[PDB]
Amino acid sequence: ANLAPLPPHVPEHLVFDFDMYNPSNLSAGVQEAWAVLQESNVPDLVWTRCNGGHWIATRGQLIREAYEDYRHFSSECPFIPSMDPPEQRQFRALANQVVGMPVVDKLENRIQELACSLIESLRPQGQCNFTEDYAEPFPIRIFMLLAGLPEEDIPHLKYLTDQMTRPDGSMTFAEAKEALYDYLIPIIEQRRQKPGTDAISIVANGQVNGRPITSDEAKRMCGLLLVGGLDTVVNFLSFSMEFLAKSPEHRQELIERPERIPAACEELLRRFSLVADGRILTSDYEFHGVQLKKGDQILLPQMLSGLDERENAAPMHVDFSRQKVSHTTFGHGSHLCLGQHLARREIIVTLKEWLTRIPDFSIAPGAQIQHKSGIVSGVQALPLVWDPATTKAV
Template identity: 30%
Template sequence: MPQSRTLDDIRVDYEAPDNVPRDRVVDLSFANGSEPNDLVDPYEPFGWLNGDDVPRLLFNPPTRYGLGAISGNQRGNWVVSHYEDIERVYTDNEHFSNAGTAEFQRLIGETFKSIPLAIDPPDHSKYRLYLMPYFSPARITRELEPRIRAIVVEMIEAVADTGEVDMAWDFGRVYPVRIFMGLMGFPDHMFEQFLDWEWDILHSGSLEKMQAALRGVLDFLRAFIAEKEREPDEHLVSAIVHGQIEGRAPTDDEKIGMVWFLWLGGLDTVAATIAQMFRRMALQPEIQQAIRERPEIINGAVEEFLRTQPILSSARTATKDFEWHGVQIRKGDSIQCLNPAGNFDPARFADPRTFDPERRANRHFTFVGGVHICLGAHLARRELRLLLEEWFKRIPEFRVKPGADTTVFPGLLSIRNLPLVWDVK
């Protein structure tokens, strides 16, 4: 059973800004994926945070939340955990800004923006329109799906007769990155180096390692962009470099801003989702059975895996002073959307903790929402659908290898190793 917590359990003594009621100051580090558990539904411990008795605005001190060094905000963060409020933060561009989001490059003095993630409307649309054709459902079906299917079939068939695979390290970590590198045109020999850099930036917790990795990856990306400027090819980095934004060539900052953003977003999230997806199916084999017997539910199953595995909780910055839910929000305040609570809000989802592959109107926040909804959402969905389609054609009922550790960090950190086994006929 999940550890039972109440607001009294998580309240902390912290000298918050004077617009923050003292009874709203809480330690929500446990809800940001920092505490592992071994539950079939690892997000269950956060479910109570969308309850009617929980204030609609909570406040997390900066020492409990790890982005202060990156955002420059040392004051702490407001946190919203109810579906309705999360939806407002993601869609109300008048009051909430995405500027500065995930701009790790600031740690080494870089000033370019992560594009289009950290760009607000109206400029956001020109960059989104510039990149969106490369991630459209039609292009994915026409150009990328055959390659995706070939890769996933090759990887499954390589392990089918062995009866065993580490689904997190040897499969989930590899499969989406192979697709991403092919899409971008990056050389295969950079695979392990990319993952090492990405781990140090997002997960090491060491400023020194983050800065070294940032210098390494940005030096590589700038050199790669220069190479594509000299020698164009058919891949995405070359298309970005040689395209036209509203009739003009992109600037150097725009080029690195777009390529860097795609690099940062293309390596980790699908890998974490795959690991958690297969962990859930191994621990709850009736889900396997349902998909195996009715493959037509795969699309709905993928959507439900996404809803029940919200990898990220995004933040926005208040653009002005305003009152919300009886509390004064000030310009510059940071507001975090706690997707692991919002995706299970009973006000939006009937019987929210039940895995229902036939759930209707499944509008979750795993890909965020509003104009900043994940650019690669269609690609991620296709990767997951094709994986399930081809996996269940070739692999019988699987289970966690006896004795294996099945604890999971319910977030981006997720699972490093997930050994699965099945009976080979």
């Protein structure tokens, strides 16, 4: 059944054959399907024989510990079946000049203007497919604004990024990546010569280790800033809007109590956490009584820390007034999402603008929403409807 044979250092009593790309109970919702790993008969660290064979840490304490311990759990192979500290700190520091908290605070209303334009387009229609019509266009338009790229390039960039996460067969993953680099290289070179204040100019003019960043370093940094802020945001906004379409009392709460929108964002980030990446052991290492071997891959699912009942009570319920929202949805440790501040502002702006203009909306009649699981889990489609006479062209 596609199972890799058990390595001889792994005890049989820790084997649980969870498949991160096709978990059993996916029609209950992806977070629910993954929470099978937190049932009380499942140890805190298990081995699955799926996807080549790899460990899974199932509890927040272990997932945080491993992400803290970059000496033993390296990001050189984070994907199942890429840099660690000090170089990594140099590149982060450079990325932070593009998406750090000061930039996001200066840029917050550009983000709100984009949301309002998209939302006002859709509002009189009384229907949309949220994933396609808002969740994808909003982060890609923010990228083009931040990167100083023109509107007419959106469809071709969206296309290249779609081929990495869901190829239609036109391009290999390698061709998609090279096509993207081919697009970015000449703009990086131009803006090294004639910089502006956009993101690509900031990157193209950084220094690594006492010298000008190379073309190769800059294309990879630009590429990671672009792909990092797309599938995660698209899918997270869709999980959150799926929940709000199904829960009118939570819509009402935020309409009545808009000051709670930033806390609601944090709680949605906990409940609809969606990333599950990995590390590779750099050496043999005993971790909580379990012998790990050099070279073993371990999935450390950021999704699971906040769903762990040990971290949050009644973790499947959405409660915007939780006193302490514990999660690792943007990661933990040295690779903690550089985009965490930009993403929170995109979530808060989308909650404020959507519930202002379209306060009452539902899942389309008859639609059954379907999820997909993987390194970034997500929503296949989100058909929504509403009565235009209940909307506000504010």
